[PDB]
Short mmCIF file of C-alpha atoms and ligand atoms in Angstrom, two decimals:
data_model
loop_
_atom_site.label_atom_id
_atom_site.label_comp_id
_atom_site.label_asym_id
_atom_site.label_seq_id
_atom_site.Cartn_x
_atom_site.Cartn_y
_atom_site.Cartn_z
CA UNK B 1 99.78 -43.63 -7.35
CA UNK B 2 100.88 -46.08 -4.97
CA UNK B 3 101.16 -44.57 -1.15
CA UNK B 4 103.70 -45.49 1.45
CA UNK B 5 102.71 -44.82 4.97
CA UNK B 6 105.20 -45.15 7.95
CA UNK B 7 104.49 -45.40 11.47
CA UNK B 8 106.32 -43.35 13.89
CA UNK B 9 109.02 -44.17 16.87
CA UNK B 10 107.82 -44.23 20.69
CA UNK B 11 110.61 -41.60 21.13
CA UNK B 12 112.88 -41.45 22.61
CA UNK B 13 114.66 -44.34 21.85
CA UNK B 14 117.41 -46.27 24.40
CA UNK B 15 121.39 -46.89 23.21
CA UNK B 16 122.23 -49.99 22.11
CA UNK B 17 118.65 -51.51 21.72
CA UNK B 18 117.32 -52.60 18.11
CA UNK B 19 114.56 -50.42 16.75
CA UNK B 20 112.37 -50.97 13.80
CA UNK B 21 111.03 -48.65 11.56
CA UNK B 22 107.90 -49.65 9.41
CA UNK B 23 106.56 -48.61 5.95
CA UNK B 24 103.70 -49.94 3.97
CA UNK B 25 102.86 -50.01 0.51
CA UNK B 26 99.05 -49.97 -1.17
CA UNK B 27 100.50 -51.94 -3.22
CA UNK B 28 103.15 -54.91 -3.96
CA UNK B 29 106.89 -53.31 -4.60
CA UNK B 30 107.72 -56.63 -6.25
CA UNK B 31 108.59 -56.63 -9.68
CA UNK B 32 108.93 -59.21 -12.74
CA UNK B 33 112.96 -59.47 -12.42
CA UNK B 34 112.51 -60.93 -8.09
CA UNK B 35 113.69 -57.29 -6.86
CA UNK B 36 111.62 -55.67 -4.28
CA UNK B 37 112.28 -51.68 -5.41
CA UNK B 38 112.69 -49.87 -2.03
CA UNK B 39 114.78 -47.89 -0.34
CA UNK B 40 115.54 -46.55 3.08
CA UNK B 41 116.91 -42.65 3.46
CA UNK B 42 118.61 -40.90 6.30
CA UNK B 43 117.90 -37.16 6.27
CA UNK B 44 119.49 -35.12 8.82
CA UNK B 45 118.68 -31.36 9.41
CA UNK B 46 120.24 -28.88 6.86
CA UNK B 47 121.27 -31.70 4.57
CA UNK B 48 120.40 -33.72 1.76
CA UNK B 49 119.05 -37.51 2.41
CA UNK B 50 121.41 -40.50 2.50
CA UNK B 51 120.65 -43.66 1.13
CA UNK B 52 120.64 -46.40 3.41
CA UNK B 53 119.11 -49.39 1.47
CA UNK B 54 118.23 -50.42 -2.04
CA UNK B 55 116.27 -52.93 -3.17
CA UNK B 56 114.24 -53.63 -0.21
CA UNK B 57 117.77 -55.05 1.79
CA UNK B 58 121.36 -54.13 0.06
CA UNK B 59 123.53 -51.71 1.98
CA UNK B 60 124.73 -49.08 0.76
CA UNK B 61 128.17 -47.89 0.36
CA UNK B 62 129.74 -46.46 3.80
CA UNK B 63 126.31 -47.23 5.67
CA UNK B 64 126.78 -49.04 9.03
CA UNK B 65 126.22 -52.73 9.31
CA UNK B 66 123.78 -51.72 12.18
CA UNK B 67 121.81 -51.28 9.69
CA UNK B 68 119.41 -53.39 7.64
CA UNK B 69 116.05 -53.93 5.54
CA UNK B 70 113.17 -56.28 5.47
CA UNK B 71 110.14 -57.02 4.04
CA UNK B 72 107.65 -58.64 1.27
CA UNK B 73 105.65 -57.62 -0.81
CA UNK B 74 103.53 -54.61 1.29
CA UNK B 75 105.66 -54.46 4.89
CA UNK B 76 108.71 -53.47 5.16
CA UNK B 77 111.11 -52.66 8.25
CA UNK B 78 114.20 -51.03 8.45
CA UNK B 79 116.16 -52.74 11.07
CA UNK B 80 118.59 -50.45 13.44
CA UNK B 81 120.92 -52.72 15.55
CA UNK B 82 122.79 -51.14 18.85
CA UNK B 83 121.07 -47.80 18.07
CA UNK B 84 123.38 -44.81 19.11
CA UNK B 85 123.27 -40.96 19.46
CA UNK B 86 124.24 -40.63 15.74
CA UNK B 87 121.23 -42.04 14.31
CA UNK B 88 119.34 -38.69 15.05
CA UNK B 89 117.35 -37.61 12.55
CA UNK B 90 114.47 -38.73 9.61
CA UNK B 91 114.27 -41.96 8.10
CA UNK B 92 112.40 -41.99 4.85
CA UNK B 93 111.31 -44.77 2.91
CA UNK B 94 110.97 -44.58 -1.29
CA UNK B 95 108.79 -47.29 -3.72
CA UNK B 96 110.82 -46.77 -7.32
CA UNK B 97 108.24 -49.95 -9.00
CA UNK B 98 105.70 -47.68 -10.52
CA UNK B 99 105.74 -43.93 -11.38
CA UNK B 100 105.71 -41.93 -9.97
CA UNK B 101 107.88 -42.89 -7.58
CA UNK B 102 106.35 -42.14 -3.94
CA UNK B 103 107.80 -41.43 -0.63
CA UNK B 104 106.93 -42.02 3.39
CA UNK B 105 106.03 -38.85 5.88
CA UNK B 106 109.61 -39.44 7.51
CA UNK B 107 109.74 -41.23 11.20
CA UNK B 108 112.14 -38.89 13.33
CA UNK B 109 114.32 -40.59 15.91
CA UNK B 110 115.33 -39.37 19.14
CA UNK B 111 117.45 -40.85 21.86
CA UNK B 112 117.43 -40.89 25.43
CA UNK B 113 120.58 -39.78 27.24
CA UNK B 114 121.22 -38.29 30.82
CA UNK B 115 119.49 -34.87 32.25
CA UNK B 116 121.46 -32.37 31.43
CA UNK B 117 120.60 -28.36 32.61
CA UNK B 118 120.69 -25.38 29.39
CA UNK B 119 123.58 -22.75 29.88
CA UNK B 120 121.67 -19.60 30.01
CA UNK B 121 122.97 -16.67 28.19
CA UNK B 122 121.04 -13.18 27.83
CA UNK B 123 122.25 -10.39 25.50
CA UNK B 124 120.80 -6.81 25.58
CA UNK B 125 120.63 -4.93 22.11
CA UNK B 126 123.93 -3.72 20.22
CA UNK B 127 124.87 -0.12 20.06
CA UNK B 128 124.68 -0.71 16.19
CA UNK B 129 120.97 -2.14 16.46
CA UNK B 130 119.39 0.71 18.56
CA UNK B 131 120.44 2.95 15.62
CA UNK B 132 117.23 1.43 13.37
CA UNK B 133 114.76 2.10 16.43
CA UNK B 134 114.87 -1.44 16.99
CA UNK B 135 115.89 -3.17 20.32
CA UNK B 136 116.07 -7.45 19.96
CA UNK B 137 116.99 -8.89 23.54
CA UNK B 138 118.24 -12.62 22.69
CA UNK B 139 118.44 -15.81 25.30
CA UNK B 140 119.98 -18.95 24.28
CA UNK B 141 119.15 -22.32 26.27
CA UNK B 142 122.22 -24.11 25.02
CA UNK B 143 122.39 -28.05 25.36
CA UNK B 144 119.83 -29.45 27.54
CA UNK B 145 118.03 -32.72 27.79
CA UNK B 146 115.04 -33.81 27.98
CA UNK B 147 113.41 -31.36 25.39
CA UNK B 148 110.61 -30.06 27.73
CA UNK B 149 111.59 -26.57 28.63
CA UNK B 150 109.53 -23.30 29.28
CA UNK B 151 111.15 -19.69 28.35
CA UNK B 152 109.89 -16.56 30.09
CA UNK B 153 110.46 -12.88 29.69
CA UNK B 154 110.31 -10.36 32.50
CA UNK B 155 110.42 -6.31 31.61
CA UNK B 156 110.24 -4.33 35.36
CA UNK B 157 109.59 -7.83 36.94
CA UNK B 158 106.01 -8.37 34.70
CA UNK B 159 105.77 -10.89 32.11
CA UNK B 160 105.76 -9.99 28.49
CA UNK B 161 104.75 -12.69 25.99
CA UNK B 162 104.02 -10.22 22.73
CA UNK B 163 107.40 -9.60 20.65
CA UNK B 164 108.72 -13.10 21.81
CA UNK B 165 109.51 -15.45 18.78
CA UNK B 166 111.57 -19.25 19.55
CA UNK B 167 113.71 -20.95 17.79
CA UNK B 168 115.42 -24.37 18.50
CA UNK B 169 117.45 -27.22 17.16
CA UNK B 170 116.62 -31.25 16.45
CA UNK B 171 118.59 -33.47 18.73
CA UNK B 172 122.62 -32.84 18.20
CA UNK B 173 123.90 -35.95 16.88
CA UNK B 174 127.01 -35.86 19.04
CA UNK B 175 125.71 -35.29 22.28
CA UNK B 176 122.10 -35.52 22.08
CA UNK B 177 120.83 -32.78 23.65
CA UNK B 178 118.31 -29.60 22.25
CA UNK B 179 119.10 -26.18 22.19
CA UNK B 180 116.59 -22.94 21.98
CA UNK B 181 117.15 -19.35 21.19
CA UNK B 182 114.64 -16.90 22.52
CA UNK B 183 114.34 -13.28 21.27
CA UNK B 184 112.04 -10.39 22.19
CA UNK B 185 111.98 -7.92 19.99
CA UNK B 186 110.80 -4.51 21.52
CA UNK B 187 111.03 -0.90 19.15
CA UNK B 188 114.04 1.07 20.77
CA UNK B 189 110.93 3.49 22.00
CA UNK B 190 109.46 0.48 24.22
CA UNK B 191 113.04 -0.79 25.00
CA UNK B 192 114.04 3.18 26.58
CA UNK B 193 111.03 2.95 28.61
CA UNK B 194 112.04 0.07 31.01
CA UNK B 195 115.13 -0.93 33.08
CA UNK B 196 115.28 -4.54 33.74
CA UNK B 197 115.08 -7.43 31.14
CA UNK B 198 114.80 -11.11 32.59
CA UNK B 199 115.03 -14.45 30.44
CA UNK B 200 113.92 -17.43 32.49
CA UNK B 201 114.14 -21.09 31.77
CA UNK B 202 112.16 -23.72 33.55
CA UNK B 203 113.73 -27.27 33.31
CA UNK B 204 113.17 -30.52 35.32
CA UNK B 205 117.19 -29.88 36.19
CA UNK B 206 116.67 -27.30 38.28
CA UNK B 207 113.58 -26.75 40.82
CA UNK B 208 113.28 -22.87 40.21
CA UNK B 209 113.95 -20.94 37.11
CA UNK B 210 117.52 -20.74 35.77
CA UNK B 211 117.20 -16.61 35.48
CA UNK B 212 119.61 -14.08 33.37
CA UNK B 213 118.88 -10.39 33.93
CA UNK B 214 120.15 -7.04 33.07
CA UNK B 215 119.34 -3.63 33.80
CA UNK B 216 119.70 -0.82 31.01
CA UNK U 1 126.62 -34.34 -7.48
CA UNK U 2 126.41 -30.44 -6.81
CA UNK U 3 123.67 -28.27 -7.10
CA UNK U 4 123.24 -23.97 -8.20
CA UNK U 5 123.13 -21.47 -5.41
CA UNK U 6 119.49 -20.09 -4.22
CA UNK U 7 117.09 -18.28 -6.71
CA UNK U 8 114.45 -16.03 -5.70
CA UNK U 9 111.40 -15.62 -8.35
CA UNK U 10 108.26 -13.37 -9.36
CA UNK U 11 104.79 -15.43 -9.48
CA UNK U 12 104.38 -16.21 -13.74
CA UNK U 13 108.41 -15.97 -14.46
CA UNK U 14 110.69 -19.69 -14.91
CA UNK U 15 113.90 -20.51 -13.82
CA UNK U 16 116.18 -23.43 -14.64
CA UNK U 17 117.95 -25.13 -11.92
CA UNK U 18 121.49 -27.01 -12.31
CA UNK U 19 123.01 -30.07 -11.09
CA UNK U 20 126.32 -31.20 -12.10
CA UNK U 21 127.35 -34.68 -11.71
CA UNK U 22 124.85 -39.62 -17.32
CA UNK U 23 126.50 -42.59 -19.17
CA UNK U 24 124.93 -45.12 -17.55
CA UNK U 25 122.78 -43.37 -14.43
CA UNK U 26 120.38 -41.15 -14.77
CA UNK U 27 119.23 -38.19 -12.51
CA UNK U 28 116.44 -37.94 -10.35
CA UNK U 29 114.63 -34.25 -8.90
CA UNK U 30 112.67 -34.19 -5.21
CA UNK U 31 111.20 -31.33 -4.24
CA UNK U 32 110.76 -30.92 -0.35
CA UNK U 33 108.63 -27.52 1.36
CA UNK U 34 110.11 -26.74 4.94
CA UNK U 35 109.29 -29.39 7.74
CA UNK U 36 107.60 -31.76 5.46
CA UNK U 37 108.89 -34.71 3.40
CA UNK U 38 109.85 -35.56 -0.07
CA UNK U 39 107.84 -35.58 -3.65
CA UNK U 40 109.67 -36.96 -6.92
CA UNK U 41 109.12 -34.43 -10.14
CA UNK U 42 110.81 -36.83 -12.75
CA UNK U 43 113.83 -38.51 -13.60
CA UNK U 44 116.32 -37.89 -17.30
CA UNK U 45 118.20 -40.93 -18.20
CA UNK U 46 120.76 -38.90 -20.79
CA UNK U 47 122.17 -41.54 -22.37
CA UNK U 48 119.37 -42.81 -23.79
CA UNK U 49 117.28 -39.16 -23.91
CA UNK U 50 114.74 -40.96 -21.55
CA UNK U 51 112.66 -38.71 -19.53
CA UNK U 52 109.25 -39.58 -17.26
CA UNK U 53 107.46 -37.21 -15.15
CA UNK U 54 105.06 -37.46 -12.40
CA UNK U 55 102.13 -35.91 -14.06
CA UNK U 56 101.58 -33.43 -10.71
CA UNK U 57 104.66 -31.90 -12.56
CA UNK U 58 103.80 -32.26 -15.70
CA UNK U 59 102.91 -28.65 -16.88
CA UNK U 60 105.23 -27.27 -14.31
CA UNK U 61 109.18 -29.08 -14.75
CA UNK U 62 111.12 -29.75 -18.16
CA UNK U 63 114.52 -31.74 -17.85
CA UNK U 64 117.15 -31.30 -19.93
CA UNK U 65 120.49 -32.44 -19.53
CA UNK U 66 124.07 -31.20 -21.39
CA UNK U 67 125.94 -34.23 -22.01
CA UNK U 68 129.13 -32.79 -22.47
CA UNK U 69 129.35 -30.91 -19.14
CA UNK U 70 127.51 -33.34 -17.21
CA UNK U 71 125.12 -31.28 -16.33
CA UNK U 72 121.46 -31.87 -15.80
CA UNK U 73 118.62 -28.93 -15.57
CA UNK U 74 115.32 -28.77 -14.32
CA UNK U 75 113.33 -25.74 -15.61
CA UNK U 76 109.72 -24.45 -13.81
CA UNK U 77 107.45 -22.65 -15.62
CA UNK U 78 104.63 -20.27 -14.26
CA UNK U 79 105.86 -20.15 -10.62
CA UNK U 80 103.45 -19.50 -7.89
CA UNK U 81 103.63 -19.33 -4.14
CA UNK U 82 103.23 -23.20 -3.61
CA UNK U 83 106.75 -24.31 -6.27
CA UNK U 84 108.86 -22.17 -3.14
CA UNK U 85 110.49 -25.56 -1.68
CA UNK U 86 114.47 -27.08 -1.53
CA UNK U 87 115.00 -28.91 -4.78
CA UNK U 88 117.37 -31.88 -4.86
CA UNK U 89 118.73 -33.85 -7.67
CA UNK U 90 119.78 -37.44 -6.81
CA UNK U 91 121.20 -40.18 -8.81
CA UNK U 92 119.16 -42.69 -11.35
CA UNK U 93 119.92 -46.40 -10.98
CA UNK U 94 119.10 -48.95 -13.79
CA UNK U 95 116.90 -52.10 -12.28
CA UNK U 96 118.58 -54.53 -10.62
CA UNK U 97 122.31 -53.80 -11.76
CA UNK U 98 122.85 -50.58 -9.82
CA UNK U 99 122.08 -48.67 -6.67
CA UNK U 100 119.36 -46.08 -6.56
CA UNK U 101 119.24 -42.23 -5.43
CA UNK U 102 122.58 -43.05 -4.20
CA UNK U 103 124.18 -39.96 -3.95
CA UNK U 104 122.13 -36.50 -3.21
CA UNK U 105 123.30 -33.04 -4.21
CA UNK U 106 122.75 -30.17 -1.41
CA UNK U 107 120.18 -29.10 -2.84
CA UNK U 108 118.85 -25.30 -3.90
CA UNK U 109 116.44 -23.28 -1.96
CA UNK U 110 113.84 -21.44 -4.54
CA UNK U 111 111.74 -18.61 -3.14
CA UNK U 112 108.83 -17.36 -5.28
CA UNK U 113 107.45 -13.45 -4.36
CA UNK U 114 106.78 -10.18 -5.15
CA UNK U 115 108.95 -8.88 -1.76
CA UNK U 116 112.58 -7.50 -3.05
CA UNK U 117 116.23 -8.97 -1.82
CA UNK U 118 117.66 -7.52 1.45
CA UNK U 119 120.58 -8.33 2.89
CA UNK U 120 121.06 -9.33 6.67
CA UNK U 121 121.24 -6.51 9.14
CA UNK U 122 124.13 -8.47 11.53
CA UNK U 123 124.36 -7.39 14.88
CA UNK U 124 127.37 -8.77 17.69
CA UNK U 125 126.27 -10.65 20.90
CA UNK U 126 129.07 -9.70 23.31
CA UNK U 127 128.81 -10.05 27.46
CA UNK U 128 135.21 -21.33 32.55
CA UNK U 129 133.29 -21.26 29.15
CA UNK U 130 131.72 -17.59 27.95
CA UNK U 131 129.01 -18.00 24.87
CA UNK U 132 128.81 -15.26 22.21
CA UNK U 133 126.32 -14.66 19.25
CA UNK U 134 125.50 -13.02 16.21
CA UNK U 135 122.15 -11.62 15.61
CA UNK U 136 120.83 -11.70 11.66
CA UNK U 137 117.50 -10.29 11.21
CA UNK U 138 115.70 -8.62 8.38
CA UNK U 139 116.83 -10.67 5.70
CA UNK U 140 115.17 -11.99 2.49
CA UNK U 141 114.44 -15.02 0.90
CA UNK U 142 116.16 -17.51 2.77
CA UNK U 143 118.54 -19.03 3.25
CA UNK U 144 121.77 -17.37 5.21
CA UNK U 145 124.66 -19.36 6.02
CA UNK U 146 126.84 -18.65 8.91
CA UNK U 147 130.30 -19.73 9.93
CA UNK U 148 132.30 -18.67 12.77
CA UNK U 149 135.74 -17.72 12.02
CA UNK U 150 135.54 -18.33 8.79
CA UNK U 151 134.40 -22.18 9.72
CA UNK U 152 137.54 -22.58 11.65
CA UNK U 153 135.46 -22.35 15.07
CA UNK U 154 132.58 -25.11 14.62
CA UNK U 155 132.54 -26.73 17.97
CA UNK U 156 129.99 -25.40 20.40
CA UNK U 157 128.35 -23.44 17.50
CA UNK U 158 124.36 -23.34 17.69
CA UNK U 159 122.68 -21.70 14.32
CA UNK U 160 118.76 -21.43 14.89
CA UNK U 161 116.20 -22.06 12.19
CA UNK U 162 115.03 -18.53 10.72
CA UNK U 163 111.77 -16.90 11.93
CA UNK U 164 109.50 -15.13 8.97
CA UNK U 165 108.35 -11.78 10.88
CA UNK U 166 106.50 -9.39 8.63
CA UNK U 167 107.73 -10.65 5.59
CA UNK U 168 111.67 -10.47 6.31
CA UNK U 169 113.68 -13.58 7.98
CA UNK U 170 115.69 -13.50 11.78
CA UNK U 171 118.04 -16.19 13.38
CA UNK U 172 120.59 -16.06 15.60
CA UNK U 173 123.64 -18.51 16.12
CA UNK U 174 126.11 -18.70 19.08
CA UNK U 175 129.52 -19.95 19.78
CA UNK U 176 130.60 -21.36 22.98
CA UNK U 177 134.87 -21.08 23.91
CA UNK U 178 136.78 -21.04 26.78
CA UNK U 179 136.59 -17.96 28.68
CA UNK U 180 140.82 -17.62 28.61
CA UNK U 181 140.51 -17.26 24.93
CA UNK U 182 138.07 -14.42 24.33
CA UNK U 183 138.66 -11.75 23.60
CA UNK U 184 142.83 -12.79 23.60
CA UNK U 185 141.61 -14.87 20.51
CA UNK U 186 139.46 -13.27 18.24
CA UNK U 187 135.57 -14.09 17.28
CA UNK U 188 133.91 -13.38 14.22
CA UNK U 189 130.80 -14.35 12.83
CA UNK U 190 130.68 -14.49 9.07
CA UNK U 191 127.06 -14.34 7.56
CA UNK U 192 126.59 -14.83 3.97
CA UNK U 193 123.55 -14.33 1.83
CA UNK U 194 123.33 -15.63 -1.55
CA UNK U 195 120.20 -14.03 -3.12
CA UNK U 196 121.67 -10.52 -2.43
CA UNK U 197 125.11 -11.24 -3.19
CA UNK U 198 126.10 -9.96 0.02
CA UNK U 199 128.75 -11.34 2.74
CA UNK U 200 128.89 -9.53 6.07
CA UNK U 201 131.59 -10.25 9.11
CA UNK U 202 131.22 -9.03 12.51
CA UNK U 203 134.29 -9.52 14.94
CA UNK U 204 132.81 -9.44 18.40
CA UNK U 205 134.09 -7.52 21.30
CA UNK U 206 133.67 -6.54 24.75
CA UNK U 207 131.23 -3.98 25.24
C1 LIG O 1 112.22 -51.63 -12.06
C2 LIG O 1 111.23 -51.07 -12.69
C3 LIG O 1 110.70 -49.72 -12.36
N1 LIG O 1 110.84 -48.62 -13.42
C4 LIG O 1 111.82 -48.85 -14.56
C5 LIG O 1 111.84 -48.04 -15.89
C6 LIG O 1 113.33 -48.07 -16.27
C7 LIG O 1 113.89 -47.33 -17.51
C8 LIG O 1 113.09 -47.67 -18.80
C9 LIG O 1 113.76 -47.15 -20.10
C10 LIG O 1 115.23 -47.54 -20.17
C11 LIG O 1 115.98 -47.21 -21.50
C12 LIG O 1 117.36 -47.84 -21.62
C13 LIG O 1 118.30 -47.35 -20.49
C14 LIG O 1 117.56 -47.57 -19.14
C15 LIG O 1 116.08 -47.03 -18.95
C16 LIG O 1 116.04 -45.51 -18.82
C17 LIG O 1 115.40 -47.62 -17.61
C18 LIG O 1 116.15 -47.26 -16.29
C19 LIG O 1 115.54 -48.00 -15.08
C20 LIG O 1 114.02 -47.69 -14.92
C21 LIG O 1 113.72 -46.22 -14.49
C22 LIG O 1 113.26 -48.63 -13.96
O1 LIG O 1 113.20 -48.11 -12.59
C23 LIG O 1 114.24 -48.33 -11.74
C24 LIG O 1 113.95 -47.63 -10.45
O2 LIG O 1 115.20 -49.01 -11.99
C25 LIG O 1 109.53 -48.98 -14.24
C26 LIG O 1 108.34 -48.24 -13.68
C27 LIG O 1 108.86 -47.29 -12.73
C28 LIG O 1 110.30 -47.23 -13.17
#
């Protein structure tokens, strides 16, 4: 089987510069007819990849001219021109000469854009939740930048690290920034037993902890 | 090309997956396991009842393909833990004269287990700009899909990847409006869940 092997970005990337994205091949993609047979993929989260290239350089339909493919033989680049904050996301590279047909490990791309603070927003459990015996506290850190971020929870004022599970996005292709939802999930018999509930983001925007609190 | 909604599978049983579009092009199938990247299974050229395999997939995938409907199927025998994964179908080009995996279906999520269906449990988030939520927890397989009002409210939406928690799925999504329109302008969350058949709405309000 022949193996394709890409390198990754130095992420994050800056607007408007080129960036190239390499893949290489154990073996030659050229076959008998001239026609170099690889392609270049686009895969963004929660959808299906786009083709980008075939054939080692033809656009495809409805791709930006930005961008392009080169190569011979073993190397290969694809070629981003004026990169921009829509080009978030995995670029995957394909060789279709021999079966089976193989595939790159992806090369994500991120982009830099200005700081920007998350909007903080705790919730304490629903009326309908407490019903089950369970209590879920939930903290989104909507839309900041850069991705570095820290969440905390506070019960009484002491941290609690045990019933905490994250979540978070890939860059937002329209305004490039990352977003995280934190939830601590306490049984209503834990939750009952304590007043106040804290959710606490640490961010290079701000020098102390953006806090949200409520007391049951 | 479009794909069949999400299956969920014993370990041992097969299913047969669908993707309508086989002339000319043929029709590829990728599978792809959460956070990691792509693997071909094989490619049916209808037309001329060509099919190759890779040979990982050899005992595992047949492809068939219904000529009349345009309709190509993929089927997986003796399922185990490791076939759970999105499968895609993609289009087949033909050398130099055509593109290749030029247009991608959406793909179908396939769960294999012994754990049973259960719908979402959906709880409301309520409190210039005020954000609201809707929590979705013990849910399973994957995947959910959420829209807010109906899909009619998409800006400032945030839907998390789900969290696996003793074998039953959580996320959470928000929405973001201006703080003038809620709750003068109503809010719902609608959470659908294919694998149970199940579609649940919850119109948030003040506490
Ligand atoms: C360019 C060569 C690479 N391969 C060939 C193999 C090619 C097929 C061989 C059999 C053909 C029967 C007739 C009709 C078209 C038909 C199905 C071909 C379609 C293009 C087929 C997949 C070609 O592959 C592509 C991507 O065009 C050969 C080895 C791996 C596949």
């Amino acid at each position: 089987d022949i193996v394709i092997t890409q390198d990754e970005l130095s992420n994050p990337v800056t607007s408007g510069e080129s960036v190239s994205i390499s893949c290489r091949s154990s073996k030659s993609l050229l076959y008998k007819d001239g026609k170099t047979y690889l392609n270049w993929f686009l895969q963004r989260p929660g959808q299906s990849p786009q083709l980008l290239i075939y054939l080692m350089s033809t656009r495809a339909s409805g791709v930006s001219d930005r961008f392009s493919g080169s190569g011979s033989g073993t190397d290969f680049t694809l070629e981003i021109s004026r990169v921009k904050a829509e080009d978030v996301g995995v670029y995957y590279c394909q060789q279709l000469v021999e079966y089976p047909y193989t595939f790159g490990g992806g090369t994500k791309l991120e982009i830099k854009r200005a700081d920007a603070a998350p909007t903080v927003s705790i919730f304490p459990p629903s009326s309908e939740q407490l019903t089950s015996g369970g209590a879920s506290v939930v903290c989104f850190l909507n839309n900041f930048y850069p991705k570095d971020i820290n969440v905390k929870w506070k019960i009484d004022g002491s941290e609690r690290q045990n019933g905490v599970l994250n979540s978070w996005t890939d860059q937002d292709s329209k305004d490039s920034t990352y977003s995280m939802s934190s939830t601590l999930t306490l049984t209503k018999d834990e939750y009952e037993r304590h007043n106040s509930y804290t959710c606490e983001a640490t961010h290079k925007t701000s020098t102390s902890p953006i806090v949200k609190s409520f007391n049951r | 090309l479009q794909q069949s909604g999400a299956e969920l599978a014993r370990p041992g049983a097969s299913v047969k997956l669908s993707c309508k579009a086989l002339t000319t092009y043929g029709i590829n199938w990728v599978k792809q396991r959460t956070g990691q990247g792509l693997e071909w299974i094989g490619e049916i050229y209808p037309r001329s009842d060509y099919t190759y395999y890779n040979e990982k997939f050899k005992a595992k995938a047949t492809l068939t393909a219904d000529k009349s409907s345009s309709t190509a199927y993929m089927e997986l025998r003796s399922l185990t833990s490791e076939d759970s994964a999105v499968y895609f179908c993609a289009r087949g080009g033909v050398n130099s004269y055509t593109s290749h995996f030029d247009y991608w279906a959406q793909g179908t999520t396939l769960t294999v287990s012994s754990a049973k269906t259960t719908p979402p449990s959906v709880y409301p988030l309520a409190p210039s700009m005020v954000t609201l939520g809707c929590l979705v927890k013990g849910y399973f397989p994957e995947p959910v899909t959420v829209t807010w009002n109906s899909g009619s409210l998409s800006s400032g939406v945030h839907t998390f990847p789900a969290v696996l928690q003793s074998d039953l799925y959580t996320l959470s999504s928000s929405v973001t409006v201006p703080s003038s329109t809620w709750p003068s302008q109503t809010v719902t969350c609608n959470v659908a869940h294919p694998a149970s058949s199940t579609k649940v709405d919850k119109k948030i309000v003040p506490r």
